[PDB]
Paper text:
We show that MtPrpR has a novel overall structure and directly binds to CoA or short-chain acyl-CoA derivatives to form a homotetramer that covers the binding cavity and locks CoA tightly inside the protein. The regulation of this process involves a [4Fe4S] cluster located close to the CoA-binding cavity on a neighboring chain.
An X-ray diffraction dataset was collected and processed at 2.7 Å resolution and phased using the single-wavelength anomalous diffraction (SAD) methods with the selenomethionine-derived (Se-Met) protein crystals. However, the native protein crystallized in a similarly packed unit cell but in the higher symmetry space group, P41212, with a = b = 144.87 Å. The asymmetric unit (ASU) of the P41212 crystal contained two protein molecules and was equivalent to half of the ASU of the P212121 crystal. Nevertheless, the overall crystal unit cell volumes and the structures of both forms were nearly identical. Protein assembly analysis using the program PISA showed that MtPrpR81–486 in the crystal was a homotetramer, which was consistent with the SEC results. The four polypeptide chains organized in D2 symmetry. The shared surface area of the interface on each chain were around 2400 Å2 between Chains A and B; 1250 Å2 between Chains A and C; 340 Å2 between Chains A and D. Since the four chains in the Se-Met structure were virtually identical (Cα_RMSD < 0.3 Å), we focus on Chain A for subsequent structure depictions. After building and refining the protein atoms and the [4Fe4S] clusters into the electron density map, we observed a relatively large segment of electron density in each polypeptide chain that could not be accounted for by protein or chemicals in the purification buffer or crystallization condition. This electron density was nearly identical in shape in each of the four subunits, and was located in the cavity between the DIII and GAF-like domains in both the mFo-DFc and 2mFo-DFc difference electron density maps.
Residue numbers in the entry:
A (entry chain B), B (entry chain A): 153 to 480
C (entry chain C): 153 to 465, 467 to 480
D (entry chain D): 153 to 465, 468 to 480
């Protein structure tokens, strides 16, 4: 499974690629970058260092974010992208043409990847490079701690959106300068989890996450507003979750619509460092919400929300009782 | 998998159990039932015909809707249940003590069921009987046509809730007295589909339904309000879907909460008979929403919402292109 | 204005009518009532004590909750009403036919009411009696304290809805057995405040409440779910607000729809007694949301949400762009 | 009451200022502007034609969108603004320094304005100019008709937000090149209507609009999604309404938040021209929603939602109704 192979590639590397990250930051510093208008400077850097001409093309197809023409070294970027997104596109292409060898050797370090998986992993590492270039490690880590992890304020400072900030936060595993260890999740209204990235072993790092009581799936009921939750898994470990929906503009009233929820999760021990714990009492184990990973694999015994019987237990029927607890 | 076995049991019988339904209706008429306050009348019927004392009990555990004591023939019903729900509980018990043999032979018609499945199927048939007794077939079918399938108005007339009405609408397959053929779906915020029932073969009768563009998963974003949609599958068949959330009251601010979405679906050809098509243009194939059964088994080529690649194809990676269409 | 006259009538009486309340409770006790299935028992009491025959009529007009025919003493009640609501209707009629004189003298205690206002006040006092009969003071006050004011659990225990419980909670001003002093508000999506009741002087007891940052107006964004907020008025006083929407069933997809939000508010000092304070930090004056009574009468100086200029002040700056309207 | 004075100022002029609009368009064309990245080009224009240096400032206070320093001719623009918004700020300053006399004479055409109202109206005309420069009349009107008034698609093409597009749509009253006549509304969660603009006389042009059944107040229930409604007033006139909430980003989790709903309304006769009529049956007077201007002045007799009694109209101790103040 190509995308699952790459998910596991990043999971195995603690969602941190030291050489690549360093590389991005080095290039950011050596080439004189300054956060603020990074799109203009990335165009200039492409001109000066790779002979690549960046044009903002309002003639690209409606769905095309960028197209690179290697024969003339011409990078076309969609006019409808915001500066942060233009910067991301340009930095992705920069990874692919100017960091090709580093990415190739990083891919080689996992000899089990399939061919399709290797192509997908190249794209994933280029996206990682773009993130670590738009958000150079040191500056971003300092900003995240100074701002107490306010994702919106971080976006505002670095001119990027919610999802990108959450990506970068889940990558702060540089030895001796680590940020809060995070698990990053992306889902749609139907529960499809299309992105999993985690600094370390979490319950939802690879599978699971279909618990309707979990706040991430409640984001769509509160669109564009940040939701939060103190959650306890069936094994007693407790976690702090923040989430928010993200919507793709334009498209048109009739157009195809993009709707996702992005969630960030960490051990409850770290919650006190988040602006999102403001007003919440964290030391009270009785105010935690009991959630699970998905009913078929959830051993809780008195859940009123349970959707399916637990695959490990007895499905006893009682003809003489009516209960508000399904499959109890 | 017992609950899947029973799902397929009802699916194979076109979600209509002729013997049982008729039994219900007969008993409704022979014993003088009158729509309105069926809970009191069912208590009287239990007493007069089975010697069973129905008492309203506020001492039962919080989660108990009813408890039947066969040794003294005493049926205790939860005080916090509305009259329609009390009637449902009492009539479920009525099925189980007074229709035991009929239920057993109906189960016997499927010699492939496992033991657990046989018990679960008995409970399912008891629920079917309860529904067909609270909503006797002729009266309810006539009401459904008279009210143009307005689920709220049907509930008001028969003193029951949204979910029950939808249950009953999905069973009107009595030969020569058929209602609109429906597929009934129940989901949670996480997309777990816990109920599937269908008059005939529909796409989601047994599997699938994890398409984020399908309006059933959008019910939770518009809580307590009826949502509707003209949906088109990848094979061209068009359907009308109506859905609404249902919440279990009481429980308390800290208590466990029950939240589900219930959807009714039919061929687009039938939509014009629904009050829910009022104001909607049905003859315009361009105003239909293109949905799927779930990205991994969806062959659409330009879905902006796609969460996973379609397993029936391949998408080569293109290092030189950025798209708003995932897995193009 | 007739409805404002009666609003002020109840406001002046601290939203507690001692004689009437006591009356209800006595009647509840002397006639052997038991909380649970009060609708059946109220029908029995109407027959035994007033010769009033209660029929559940599925033939009433669609919008009629009840109609009383004094010539035959026949009380018709809508079949689509839940048992708690039927009980309420029956007890309203009970107030009007069996407590006529008490209500008349209570109204007489306010010589300023207009004639229309006196009629509206009779109906209001009958509703008060119905509330105090379905929810007898002693039992309900004890239950509220035991349940830490969980409105849903009170509704479950007494078989009534959110709005009725909140009504009754805001009336627990009986000397030597007081509940948390509350201000009761009902609004629609457009901000129209159609009900105001308060145990004591609150900011929104009589006027105001059009602040978009106030959580009550956010109830409609989170339908059927309880919303809560620690609010600070411009004068520094802090309050705890809980609110929830209430929707009228039936009616039909095309039918006329009723949607309201009901909010309960009290001084922050009392918040710790509410189940709704669970998980909330109450001692931190910095986590309070700064709201007002309505922009035109709100003196805050750096509100990004401000809708209109404050009437007490108004500078234009051709050389500046601000995210603060009417700085 | 300055803001009500300026509201009436624009209402009296059909929400179209012909001289200023033309000016904007001329300046757009004469200076070689091209739709797309107008913020950079407006910086260039400011420098070349008025000697004003536009700098992107991340040192301004958090609430300052721009500060112009007339003593050194330096316009500082907030870094957290999107390109359309930076362009809007720059064009506002351009109005105020380069169209000062035109704006002054336009204000002078209403000798009844108070002193404060004159300043507020100067700002209003500067904003009008910014809109008419970012969205040049001919080009924008053509785009609106081609795109069937898709507000999002118009925003995408011209690099601006929902509210700005709706603003511009409500001004297309240029003689012989008119767009759909619209009434533009902005409200908050509490029903406060802070903006009213109308091409012609509509019910809510100056007063009213507190009807809970009106779809504009339902936008917050469906945040960030376009809502639509076919509404009929108590006088029989029918209207098509579209609305959507708009939220101000940044600010922070604890920060002060800006939330508004912006609604566009037109006569039902025009609805068939809107993309938003797709899927709606428009000819069925029975599928129209009966709304009002606000209960105290609404004469409907069977509204279940009624909040206050109608001022133009008895208690019945023997009846209980689901229709308040019947
Ligand atoms: C999974 C995938 C197809 C999603 O495609 P998509 O839905 O079109 O969305 P994208 O991921 O391209 O971009 C969406 C947002 O994420 C951000 N983003 C993506 N990867 C990022 C990264 N590594 N660091 C920071 N931000 C990132 C983009 O900036 C964008 O922000 P925007 O919406 O404001 O422009 C795509 O991310 C991909 O191919 N990834 C390769 C790595 C991979 O397979 N990971 C598997 C994890 S389960
Ligand atoms: C699947 C199941 C465990 C769900 O349990 P639950 O979530 O606790 O909910 P219930 O279905 O018992 O009751 C919920 C509502 O559905 C209604 N309902 C349930 N079965 C019904 C039926 N056959 N006909 C009509 N209404 C029905 C109940 O009256 C109730 O209405 P209310 O909430 O307003 O009071 C349970 O329905 C069950 O055991 N069913 C029988 C087995 C079966 O059919 N399996 C096939 C699965 S597709
Ligand atoms: C204001 C008024 C017209 C509202 O009418 P309405 O919108 O038809 O709503 P009602 O008040 O009739 O009933 C709605 C709910 O409030 C409850 N309620 C009303 N008065 C109550 C009281 N005094 N105590 C407890 N509950 C009460 C009812 O039980 C009902 O609960 P339900 O929805 O579960 O059935 C009506 O309450 C009234 O006439 N009041 C008279 C007093 C008055 O004028 N108050 C002015 C306040 S500014
Ligand atoms: C209403 C007002 C006082 C304060 O408004 P505010 O809430 O602080 O915000 P602004 O109106 O300045 O800007 C909000 C949006 O409207 C847009 N906008 C404002 N005036 C506009 C116009 N004339 N044309 C087009 N777009 C306009 C801005 O571009 C901005 O878009 P953005 O959010 O993407 O950046 C101010 O707009 C004003 O000066 N109005 C004068 C005219 C008036 O009084 N009208 C009637 C009001 S009762
Ligand atoms: S059974 Fe477990 S996984 Fe399912 S809803 Fe309950 S807590 Fe969540
Ligand atoms: S790919 Fe298919 S299943 Fe997935 S969102 Fe698109 S239409 Fe729905
Ligand atoms: S100005 Fe006052 S009343 Fe208006 S939104 Fe701000 S705090 Fe609320
Ligand atoms: S009476 Fe009804 S229709 Fe008229 S304004 Fe009030 S809520 Fe709207």
């Amino acid at each position: 499974m190509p995308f699952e192979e790459v998910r596991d590639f990043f999971y195995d590397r603690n969602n941190y690629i030291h050489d690549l990250d360093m590389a991005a930051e080095r290039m950011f510093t050596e080439s004189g970058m300054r956060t603020g208008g990074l799109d203009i400077q990335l165009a200039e850097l492409m001109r000066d260092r790779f002979g690549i001409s960046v044009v903002i093309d309002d003639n690209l197809p409606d769905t095309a974010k960028r197209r690179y023409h290697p024969d003339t070294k011409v990078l076309r970027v969609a006019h409808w992208l915001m500066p942060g997104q233009r910067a991301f596109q340009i930095a992705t292409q920069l990874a692919l043409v100017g960091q090709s060898d580093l990415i190739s050797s990083i891919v080689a370090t996992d000899d089990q990847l399939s061919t399709e998986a290797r192509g997908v992993a190249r794209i994933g590492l280029a996206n990682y490079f773009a993130g670590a270039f738009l958000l150079p490690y040191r500056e971003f880590h300092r900003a995240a701690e100074q701002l107490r992890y306010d994702i919106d304020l971080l976006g505002r400072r670095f001119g990027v959106g919610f999802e990108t900030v959450c990506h970068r936060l889940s990558t702060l595993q540089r030895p001796r300068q680590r940020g809060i260890p995070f698990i990053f999740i992306r889902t749609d209204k139907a529960g499809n989890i299309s992105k999993r990235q985690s600094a370390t072993a979490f319950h939802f790092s690879r599978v699971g996450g279909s618990c309707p009581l979990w706040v991430v799936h409640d984001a769509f009921a509160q669109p564009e507003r940040i939701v939060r939750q103190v959650a306890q898994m069936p094994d007693g470990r407790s976690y702090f979750w923040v989430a928010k929906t993200t919507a793709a503009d334009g498209l048109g009233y009739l157009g195809p619509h993009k709707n996702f929820a992005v969630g960030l999760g960490c051990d409850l021990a770290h919650a006190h460092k988040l602006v999102y714990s403001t007003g919440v009492v964290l030391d009270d184990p009785s105010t935690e919400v009991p959630i699970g990973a998905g009913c078929k694999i959830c051993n809780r015994t008195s859940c009123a929300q349970r959707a399916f019987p637990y695959l490990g237990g007895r499905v006893a029927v009682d003809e003489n009782a009516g209960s508000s607890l399904p499959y109890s």
